[PDB]
Amino acid sequence: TSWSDRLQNAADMPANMDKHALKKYRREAYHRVFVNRSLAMEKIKCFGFNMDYTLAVYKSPEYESLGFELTVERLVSIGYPQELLSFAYDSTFPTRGLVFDTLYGNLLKVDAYGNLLVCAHGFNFIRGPETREQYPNKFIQRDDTERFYILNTLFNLPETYLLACLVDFFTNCPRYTSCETGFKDGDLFMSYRSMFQDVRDAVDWVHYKGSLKEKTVENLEKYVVKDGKLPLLLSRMKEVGKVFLATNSDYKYTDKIMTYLFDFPHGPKPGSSHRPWQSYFDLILVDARKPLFFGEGTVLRQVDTKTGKLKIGTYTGPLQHGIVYSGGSSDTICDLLGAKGKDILYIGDHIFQGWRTFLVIPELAQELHVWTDKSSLFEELQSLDIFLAELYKHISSIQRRIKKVTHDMDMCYGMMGSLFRSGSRQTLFASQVMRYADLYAASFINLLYYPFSYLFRAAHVLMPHES
Amino acid sequence: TSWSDRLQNAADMPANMDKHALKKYRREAYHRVFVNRSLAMEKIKCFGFNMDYTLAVYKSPEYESLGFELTVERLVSIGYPQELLSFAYDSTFPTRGLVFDTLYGNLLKVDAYGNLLVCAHGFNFIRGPETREQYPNKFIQRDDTERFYILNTLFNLPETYLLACLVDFFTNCPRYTSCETGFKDGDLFMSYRSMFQDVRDAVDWVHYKGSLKEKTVENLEKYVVKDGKLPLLLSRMKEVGKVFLATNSDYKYTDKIMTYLFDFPHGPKPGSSHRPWQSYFDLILVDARKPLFFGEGTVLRQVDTKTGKLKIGTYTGPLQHGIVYSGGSSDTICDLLGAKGKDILYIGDHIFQGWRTFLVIPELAQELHVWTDKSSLFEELQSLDIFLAELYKHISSIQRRIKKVTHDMDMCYGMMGSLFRSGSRQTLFASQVMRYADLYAASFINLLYYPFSYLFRAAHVLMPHES
Amino acid sequence: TSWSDRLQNAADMPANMDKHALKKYRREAYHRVFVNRSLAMEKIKCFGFNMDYTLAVYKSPEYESLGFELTVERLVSIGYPQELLSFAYDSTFPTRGLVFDTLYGNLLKVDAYGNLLVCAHGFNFIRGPETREQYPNKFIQRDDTERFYILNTLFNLPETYLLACLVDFFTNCPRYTSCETGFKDGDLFMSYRSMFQDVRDAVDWVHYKGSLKEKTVENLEKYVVKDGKLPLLLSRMKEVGKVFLATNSDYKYTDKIMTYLFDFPHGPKPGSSHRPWQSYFDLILVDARKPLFFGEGTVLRQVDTKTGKLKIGTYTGPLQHGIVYSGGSSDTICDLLGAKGKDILYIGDHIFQGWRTFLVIPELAQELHVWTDKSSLFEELQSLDIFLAELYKHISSIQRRIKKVTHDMDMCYGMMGSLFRSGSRQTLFASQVMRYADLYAASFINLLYYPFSYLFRAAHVLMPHES
Amino acid sequence: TSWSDRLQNAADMPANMDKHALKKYRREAYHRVFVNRSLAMEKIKCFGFNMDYTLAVYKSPEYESLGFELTVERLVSIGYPQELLSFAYDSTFPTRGLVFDTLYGNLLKVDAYGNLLVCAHGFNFIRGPETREQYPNKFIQRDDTERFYILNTLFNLPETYLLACLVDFFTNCPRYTSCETGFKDGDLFMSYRSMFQDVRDAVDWVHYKGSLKEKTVENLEKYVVKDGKLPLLLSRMKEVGKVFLATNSDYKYTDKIMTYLFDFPHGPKPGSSHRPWQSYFDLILVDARKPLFFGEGTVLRQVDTKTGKLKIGTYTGPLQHGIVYSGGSSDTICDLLGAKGKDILYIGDHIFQGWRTFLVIPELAQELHVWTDKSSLFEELQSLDIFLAELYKHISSIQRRIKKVTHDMDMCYGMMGSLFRSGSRQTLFASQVMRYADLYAASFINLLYYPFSYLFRAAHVLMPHES
């Protein structure tokens, strides 16, 4: 069961909206909204949305698999060897948030402080003594952005796997000779950095210039989760505040996707008349150019919605319906909606004054199921950790047991472990979720199970001396 | 009782070094080392020290009071009105870590996200509706470094108070007319920013060009804590690894201070021969120029210890005793000591690859005593917070009670509240301690009560969905 | 007669290489190499070449006209009104080096100090009092790169004209209302900056993603000057040093163009066997990414010349023939050729340690012919200028005569005047030629008329007090 | 005869102000204003002045000699060896504008393109083959500001000489061993960069914290040129526009100096009543902080002229007399004077929108006298250069004669040659004068010999192809 199977299983449920129905439903972890920082819902005046992996949850492993194959085909088409065509996408290998080391050709899982949790070269997992040869203190400086690339997004999933496949292919194929920083074909030296750049370029091309969008849109049932509860949540939000869409996609793609997502023989609830997806938003903005959108942005433009092209000129005046914007900035959205900063909840799949944030983490659906299965393994980890400290206070192969249990726990998630941790150690990714997302969940649909004056309450944080 | 009275009270204790003596002593909060991130002491190869507020704990309120009066006298001497001489330092007003808003002339206490916890203009505490006139969402952007200055250090204590005294003086004196961004004397407009810059300049002058050092050094008994347990801890550290000093002070000041700190009729333990302070360090570095020291540093120089002046030339070769360095960088120290990054524990009073860190927070001695007195007040705060969320889930003047209890709790610390929080809300400062200090305590002497293979163990951190 | 007609007329000449034939030929201005800074040819070890407008001189006005029409068609295709299709390229309007002011929608000709020489909004030439309304001291700051874009290159010729056509169209068409900073279509405001960005984007697209290259290469006789003297000069250079090509074009385009340029029934001289264009270069580098090429560059790659695609890997070793590189940097070229800086003459059409520089200015052929026709007009300008200063030393409508003669002289060049001056005032462009080009000429073929040990001699420069 | 003897000789002349008296006086080079760029004096609305080396011309070699000795004494006082006290300042060695290479300890004279004209290590002049060992193409990159320091100002004269004295001392003294990048005293290595930084620090200290100002002001007759024609020129300027002073000096120093400069028993002309120096300026600004003054500046303050200290507050309103400002910016001056950019002539000794510029070059007085003596030597240089090019066109020891004559010409200026050239090659400094100074002269007093509607006329500049 993929995480998107879990989302699609819950998506097939009709909404029972009775008071205690919604109450007993948000006991179940997969349907809860988790809280890093308290947030009074009653004080939210606008709800903003990204499209991709937020409203439009691409099905897994199919969509990753499509991205992977189109990227492989782009690499072959620009000169990569034919053997690449025999790769097939394996959803059990990649974990989101890995670091690619372009110097050595390794994928690294790290904590917030640069400590290495997992190191793999191709499909070989480096450990202990041999890791320290390339990572002296088992440490990487993540802000050496010229060397290390953080594979942070869900669109980075196929290329996470592809990079491993390639290092493995060049490392094991006898045409090639392995080096520390790349590989030779006869006297021809190819660095892992050049190779990483070709992949990155090929992923960009598939998205901006290749057939990814085209192939998605011809089979939306295969590639995109559809949930009848979407128009219901959005119409409920529009009762209590304004709703907006800000997406990086162009207008034609957004329209095709959004039309599919609202394509039910009904509107908010069954039995009601269907309405156009545009009717659910007070403001629709495409070609947003995030993350630049959140800074200086680009000039505000306006789409001719019959042609999908930009108008010559932009409607100057106040917010009125019918209009679709393009570019601009998040500050321009505030001005148009008449609401600033903490009055705004922005719901998206990516971790980037000051809007409140709801982070959708689609993997959380499967992570939650494994987490509860492993509870014993984690509890033992805590005990060993506690007992180890007891020994040092005043033979001591508790360390090897700690190493063993940590591996076992991790393998249940896939080869690169949990998104959020390796054994008792939190990932870079988990720390950034905690620092940057006020609220997070497997799906934003989970908001539907809470009343709109709900006070989301974070646990009181105490310093070590306060506890 | 000042925090430095607490440190000086514990400093008058001889060291009972029996096994269970040290065990039962580090139950008591004021003598514990607190742990943000686990640290195996057995793996530490070098211990590094800042001098000021670390080895040399300046007595409070006397030292702040000396800084304050010399700074006031500098301002008068450069053209400030005579009424400044009737100011007297009040240790109950300043809390460390306040933000001075140079636009409006307010001191602000803030959380890590920019939310205003406390706003005071002079000695008037702005609240609710009137705060929102200048701080629209009750929010400041701390990284607008041209407007906001964070009064982060213990040397900033007198000027925190001085800035308040000045705004209060100009605001209430009838020679002057108040404006939003400063004040007039007839047609003469003086901004709060100019005024803040004069104070900052005057504090710098007192330290670098005035009589602060001179007045300290003529009365060390009045201004500096002396603790006979210092040579004992340091000699214990030198048994298990290397010890170094890196200070911003010049050689003559360091020598005067360090000689006083080792001035006992004995060495490590009573009954042992006294030794020079220099014998306790494998490496001594002065004129360090922190924080530049931690980056590119400056060229490595060497002090002629009979004159206190730089030698022409620097000893190129390996670490040998007798030598005192000047300038250089933290990377140069690693090279000389033959140990990198996580092998090093650096002990200092200020929050700035990668050395482990022990943060000395002298105020923690008094904060800990108030914390335990207020436990009831905090517990009520938690209950109200929890009960408030219960109401919103489905008249509601729980908010006014929350506002009231928060004030009451805060006033026990002084007018600007606790260093670490305002009621249930953590300060910017507390967050930075948690992010940047592996270990922290009221005093580094607390290390003496733990065995040198101790494993300092942080609580396992769980994400909201893991708990 | 276009400048490229002049180049093509001289290109139809066979080379008479007798000693005094070449001597009497380089008396004639159009065949001379002009010298800003002395250069001993005997000391040059390598000759480097850009392709475009250097080896491959695109015919004018045809090539500009092709660029213009493909750019117009791109704008219409993305939403610009149909009336754009009735524009036709006018080679008499643009002068190279104009500044587009994106705030006001004006083309400006300026001197090196920011002084306005010519201001045109669409096809209306603003003068005197009305210029000072938008340019207070008749001055622009060229390094305000967000506002002002310098239309420096020969590829900028069509868009120089296009920008004028567009401002004129929107200004005179009654669908639209004129504003200071753009224009309205009803309530729709379009800024000149947005409009400039669309043009710039459309020019980029025509070059990188549209049919410009395709249409060039299907009719090379119409679009590119062919000169039988090219292989002769290059073979002469290869006798005395190394020859290299560094171009931004990809391999397939370069090969098509370069094959055409060497397509004669003969090699260096008539009667000799034809050889491949590649045989004339010790080093060939494509996808150079200038100007980044001159700094950090990109990784050095290698082209598979049978497919036109990059090889996986790059030949590590010393320079050997057969190899074609891609990317890299100018420092990598030096390493490969074994010659640095002043040992290298780089021949190109664009003004960008330290290679010597030969600047090809194709317009110089027509500018030289007008210059000599206007000699009287310029001489009068000097006299009026001198006589004006005589009056002020001690009614004075010498200023209006100076204004009149300056206009008359300028109109002989086209509407925006000479590339190098407006009357007695030198352009920004002329100053940059003098500062940055050691040698310059209408064509690099002019090198053929000088012996290869020639000492190019600049006039001794004297300061005003030395003269 | 020093350059300041020449200025003081002309300063002893009374002003004969008859029409043709002033006409025949500005035939003589030493009394002319030279013109790089034309400037209509009739269009100038404000005249701005720096103080130092502009209004206050420090006598040479005395003032350099005072700076030198106080700097030497500062170095000894901070640990430099006693032998430094036996240095004596030699005004024949330094030429302004030399580059100190902190890597190798050489002074370099360079042209605008980085070409080495003169290289000296201590007092040894490196030539030919041995220069190329450290400067591969005889070239330095001046914008490598971490390595190369340009000794641009007249205050840099003593330290130019001092740096040479020191390299010579450490190189020839047998306590020390020479290295490529510094020198050893036993095992102690001292780099030339550290040594350069100590000198630079010591020069700064002498100026800001030592006795330079004090020693100047106690003997103004010895250190500062006094010219009775100063009040006359300034009063003439104030007839036709506004006059302002912007200086980096504080108020007390400025007042002492300016009082001395106006200390005559008369005002503008003999026979007229004396007036205070302040009466000659519409605006007086001290503590200007140039060059920051020309950018963002610092806050505008106001001096209490009875105490010399800053007022608390600044007079907000329009320009009125009596007021003395401090800090601020050049934009603030424009606002106060009601005149922008090209309406302003700024007269100073240093080469730094857009004020017109008059550069005072005190050395020009002696340079002009040598220039005319060497006219033959330069004319031969031109002939050899021309004849050399004639040979290469088609044994050739014209090069050694060119090398010889160039040396001979140069030695007439002092050991480091002319400020403006080495033989036929212009210095970096000469190029910057030509690029940045509209007008220049040995003294600004030269303005007195031109009528105030004079049109300063630059020679028409032609490109090589236009001539």
JSON list of C-alpha atoms in Angstrom, two decimals, chain D residues 298-401:
[
{"chain": "D", "resi": 298, "resn": "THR", "atom": "CA", "xyz": [25.60, 59.15, 8.02]},
{"chain": "D", "resi": 299, "resn": "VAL", "atom": "CA", "xyz": [22.80, 61.02, 9.88]},
{"chain": "D", "resi": 300, "resn": "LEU", "atom": "CA", "xyz": [22.95, 64.82, 9.61]},
{"chain": "D", "resi": 301, "resn": "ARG", "atom": "CA", "xyz": [24.10, 66.44, 12.83]},
{"chain": "D", "resi": 302, "resn": "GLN", "atom": "CA", "xyz": [24.93, 69.95, 13.97]},
{"chain": "D", "resi": 303, "resn": "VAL", "atom": "CA", "xyz": [27.93, 71.36, 15.89]},
{"chain": "D", "resi": 304, "resn": "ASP", "atom": "CA", "xyz": [27.69, 73.57, 18.96]},
{"chain": "D", "resi": 305, "resn": "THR", "atom": "CA", "xyz": [30.35, 75.99, 17.83]},
{"chain": "D", "resi": 306, "resn": "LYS", "atom": "CA", "xyz": [31.18, 77.27, 21.34]},
{"chain": "D", "resi": 307, "resn": "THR", "atom": "CA", "xyz": [32.07, 73.81, 22.63]},
{"chain": "D", "resi": 308, "resn": "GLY", "atom": "CA", "xyz": [33.06, 72.02, 19.40]},
{"chain": "D", "resi": 309, "resn": "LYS", "atom": "CA", "xyz": [30.70, 69.15, 20.38]},
{"chain": "D", "resi": 310, "resn": "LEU", "atom": "CA", "xyz": [27.54, 67.88, 18.59]},
{"chain": "D", "resi": 311, "resn": "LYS", "atom": "CA", "xyz": [24.23, 69.44, 19.54]},
{"chain": "D", "resi": 312, "resn": "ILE", "atom": "CA", "xyz": [21.48, 67.14, 20.70]},
{"chain": "D", "resi": 313, "resn": "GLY", "atom": "CA", "xyz": [19.22, 67.60, 17.69]},
{"chain": "D", "resi": 314, "resn": "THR", "atom": "CA", "xyz": [19.67, 69.12, 14.25]},
{"chain": "D", "resi": 315, "resn": "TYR", "atom": "CA", "xyz": [18.04, 72.22, 12.83]},
{"chain": "D", "resi": 316, "resn": "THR", "atom": "CA", "xyz": [15.44, 70.81, 10.46]},
{"chain": "D", "resi": 317, "resn": "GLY", "atom": "CA", "xyz": [14.60, 73.84, 8.33]},
{"chain": "D", "resi": 318, "resn": "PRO", "atom": "CA", "xyz": [16.11, 75.72, 5.35]},
{"chain": "D", "resi": 319, "resn": "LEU", "atom": "CA", "xyz": [19.71, 76.95, 5.06]},
{"chain": "D", "resi": 320, "resn": "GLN", "atom": "CA", "xyz": [20.46, 79.87, 7.43]},
{"chain": "D", "resi": 321, "resn": "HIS", "atom": "CA", "xyz": [23.84, 81.29, 8.46]},
{"chain": "D", "resi": 322, "resn": "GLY", "atom": "CA", "xyz": [25.56, 80.55, 11.76]},
{"chain": "D", "resi": 323, "resn": "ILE", "atom": "CA", "xyz": [24.94, 76.80, 11.51]},
{"chain": "D", "resi": 324, "resn": "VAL", "atom": "CA", "xyz": [27.69, 74.23, 11.15]},
{"chain": "D", "resi": 325, "resn": "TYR", "atom": "CA", "xyz": [26.71, 70.66, 10.13]},
{"chain": "D", "resi": 326, "resn": "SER", "atom": "CA", "xyz": [28.38, 67.35, 10.77]},
{"chain": "D", "resi": 327, "resn": "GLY", "atom": "CA", "xyz": [28.09, 64.05, 8.88]},
{"chain": "D", "resi": 328, "resn": "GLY", "atom": "CA", "xyz": [25.11, 63.85, 6.55]},
{"chain": "D", "resi": 329, "resn": "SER", "atom": "CA", "xyz": [25.60, 63.17, 2.83]},
{"chain": "D", "resi": 330, "resn": "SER", "atom": "CA", "xyz": [26.35, 64.93, -0.45]},
{"chain": "D", "resi": 331, "resn": "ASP", "atom": "CA", "xyz": [22.64, 64.58, -1.30]},
{"chain": "D", "resi": 332, "resn": "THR", "atom": "CA", "xyz": [21.81, 66.48, 1.88]},
{"chain": "D", "resi": 333, "resn": "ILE", "atom": "CA", "xyz": [24.11, 69.30, 0.81]},
{"chain": "D", "resi": 334, "resn": "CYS", "atom": "CA", "xyz": [22.30, 69.54, -2.56]},
{"chain": "D", "resi": 335, "resn": "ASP", "atom": "CA", "xyz": [18.95, 69.73, -0.80]},
{"chain": "D", "resi": 336, "resn": "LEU", "atom": "CA", "xyz": [20.16, 72.48, 1.55]},
{"chain": "D", "resi": 337, "resn": "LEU", "atom": "CA", "xyz": [21.83, 74.49, -1.23]},
{"chain": "D", "resi": 338, "resn": "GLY", "atom": "CA", "xyz": [18.95, 73.97, -3.67]},
{"chain": "D", "resi": 339, "resn": "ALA", "atom": "CA", "xyz": [21.27, 72.89, -6.49]},
{"chain": "D", "resi": 340, "resn": "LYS", "atom": "CA", "xyz": [21.96, 69.44, -8.01]},
{"chain": "D", "resi": 341, "resn": "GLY", "atom": "CA", "xyz": [24.79, 67.60, -9.84]},
{"chain": "D", "resi": 342, "resn": "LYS", "atom": "CA", "xyz": [26.25, 69.50, -12.80]},
{"chain": "D", "resi": 343, "resn": "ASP", "atom": "CA", "xyz": [25.33, 72.82, -11.14]},
{"chain": "D", "resi": 344, "resn": "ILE", "atom": "CA", "xyz": [28.05, 71.97, -8.60]},
{"chain": "D", "resi": 345, "resn": "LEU", "atom": "CA", "xyz": [31.84, 72.23, -8.91]},
{"chain": "D", "resi": 346, "resn": "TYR", "atom": "CA", "xyz": [33.57, 70.27, -6.15]},
{"chain": "D", "resi": 347, "resn": "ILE", "atom": "CA", "xyz": [37.23, 71.19, -5.58]},
{"chain": "D", "resi": 348, "resn": "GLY", "atom": "CA", "xyz": [39.38, 68.63, -3.75]},
{"chain": "D", "resi": 349, "resn": "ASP", "atom": "CA", "xyz": [42.66, 66.75, -3.71]},
{"chain": "D", "resi": 350, "resn": "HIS", "atom": "CA", "xyz": [41.23, 63.28, -4.09]},
{"chain": "D", "resi": 351, "resn": "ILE", "atom": "CA", "xyz": [39.81, 61.17, -6.91]},
{"chain": "D", "resi": 352, "resn": "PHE", "atom": "CA", "xyz": [36.68, 59.32, -5.72]},
{"chain": "D", "resi": 353, "resn": "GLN", "atom": "CA", "xyz": [23.69, 62.12, -9.73]},
{"chain": "D", "resi": 354, "resn": "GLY", "atom": "CA", "xyz": [27.05, 63.72, -10.49]},
{"chain": "D", "resi": 355, "resn": "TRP", "atom": "CA", "xyz": [29.01, 66.83, -9.30]},
{"chain": "D", "resi": 356, "resn": "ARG", "atom": "CA", "xyz": [31.60, 68.44, -11.62]},
{"chain": "D", "resi": 357, "resn": "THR", "atom": "CA", "xyz": [35.16, 68.06, -10.31]},
{"chain": "D", "resi": 358, "resn": "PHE", "atom": "CA", "xyz": [38.25, 70.21, -9.96]},
{"chain": "D", "resi": 359, "resn": "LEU", "atom": "CA", "xyz": [41.34, 68.19, -8.89]},
{"chain": "D", "resi": 360, "resn": "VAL", "atom": "CA", "xyz": [44.15, 69.90, -7.08]},
{"chain": "D", "resi": 361, "resn": "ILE", "atom": "CA", "xyz": [47.46, 68.10, -7.71]},
{"chain": "D", "resi": 362, "resn": "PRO", "atom": "CA", "xyz": [50.07, 69.94, -5.60]},
{"chain": "D", "resi": 363, "resn": "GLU", "atom": "CA", "xyz": [52.99, 68.05, -7.32]},
{"chain": "D", "resi": 364, "resn": "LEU", "atom": "CA", "xyz": [51.99, 69.49, -10.70]},
{"chain": "D", "resi": 365, "resn": "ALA", "atom": "CA", "xyz": [54.01, 72.62, -9.83]},
{"chain": "D", "resi": 366, "resn": "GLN", "atom": "CA", "xyz": [57.28, 70.61, -9.81]},
{"chain": "D", "resi": 367, "resn": "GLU", "atom": "CA", "xyz": [56.14, 68.10, -12.49]},
{"chain": "D", "resi": 368, "resn": "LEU", "atom": "CA", "xyz": [55.46, 71.00, -14.90]},
{"chain": "D", "resi": 369, "resn": "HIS", "atom": "CA", "xyz": [58.98, 72.39, -14.38]},
{"chain": "D", "resi": 370, "resn": "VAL", "atom": "CA", "xyz": [60.60, 68.97, -15.07]},
{"chain": "D", "resi": 371, "resn": "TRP", "atom": "CA", "xyz": [58.28, 68.25, -18.00]},
{"chain": "D", "resi": 372, "resn": "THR", "atom": "CA", "xyz": [59.53, 71.35, -19.87]},
{"chain": "D", "resi": 373, "resn": "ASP", "atom": "CA", "xyz": [63.22, 70.53, -19.07]},
{"chain": "D", "resi": 374, "resn": "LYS", "atom": "CA", "xyz": [62.72, 66.98, -20.45]},
{"chain": "D", "resi": 375, "resn": "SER", "atom": "CA", "xyz": [60.88, 67.94, -23.63]},
{"chain": "D", "resi": 376, "resn": "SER", "atom": "CA", "xyz": [63.91, 66.76, -25.67]},
{"chain": "D", "resi": 377, "resn": "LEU", "atom": "CA", "xyz": [64.07, 63.40, -23.85]},
{"chain": "D", "resi": 378, "resn": "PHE", "atom": "CA", "xyz": [60.36, 62.79, -24.50]},
{"chain": "D", "resi": 379, "resn": "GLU", "atom": "CA", "xyz": [60.65, 63.83, -28.18]},
{"chain": "D", "resi": 380, "resn": "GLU", "atom": "CA", "xyz": [63.48, 61.31, -28.65]},
{"chain": "D", "resi": 381, "resn": "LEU", "atom": "CA", "xyz": [61.33, 58.67, -26.97]},
{"chain": "D", "resi": 382, "resn": "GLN", "atom": "CA", "xyz": [58.58, 59.33, -29.50]},
{"chain": "D", "resi": 383, "resn": "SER", "atom": "CA", "xyz": [61.05, 59.06, -32.41]},
{"chain": "D", "resi": 384, "resn": "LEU", "atom": "CA", "xyz": [62.55, 55.78, -31.21]},
{"chain": "D", "resi": 385, "resn": "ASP", "atom": "CA", "xyz": [59.04, 54.35, -30.67]},
{"chain": "D", "resi": 386, "resn": "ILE", "atom": "CA", "xyz": [58.07, 55.46, -34.24]},
{"chain": "D", "resi": 387, "resn": "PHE", "atom": "CA", "xyz": [61.34, 54.23, -35.75]},
{"chain": "D", "resi": 388, "resn": "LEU", "atom": "CA", "xyz": [61.01, 50.85, -33.91]},
{"chain": "D", "resi": 389, "resn": "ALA", "atom": "CA", "xyz": [57.60, 50.26, -35.52]},
{"chain": "D", "resi": 390, "resn": "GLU", "atom": "CA", "xyz": [59.24, 51.14, -38.88]},
{"chain": "D", "resi": 391, "resn": "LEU", "atom": "CA", "xyz": [61.79, 48.31, -38.48]},
{"chain": "D", "resi": 392, "resn": "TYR", "atom": "CA", "xyz": [59.16, 45.66, -37.58]},
{"chain": "D", "resi": 393, "resn": "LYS", "atom": "CA", "xyz": [57.20, 46.51, -40.74]},
{"chain": "D", "resi": 394, "resn": "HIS", "atom": "CA", "xyz": [60.40, 45.55, -42.68]},
{"chain": "D", "resi": 395, "resn": "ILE", "atom": "CA", "xyz": [70.28, 44.63, -35.22]},
{"chain": "D", "resi": 396, "resn": "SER", "atom": "CA", "xyz": [67.31, 46.10, -33.33]},
{"chain": "D", "resi": 397, "resn": "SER", "atom": "CA", "xyz": [68.85, 47.46, -30.08]},
{"chain": "D", "resi": 398, "resn": "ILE", "atom": "CA", "xyz": [66.51, 50.46, -30.35]},
{"chain": "D", "resi": 399, "resn": "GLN", "atom": "CA", "xyz": [64.81, 48.65, -27.45]},
{"chain": "D", "resi": 400, "resn": "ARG", "atom": "CA", "xyz": [67.83, 49.10, -25.16]},
{"chain": "D", "resi": 401, "resn": "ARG", "atom": "CA", "xyz": [68.06, 52.80, -26.09]}
]
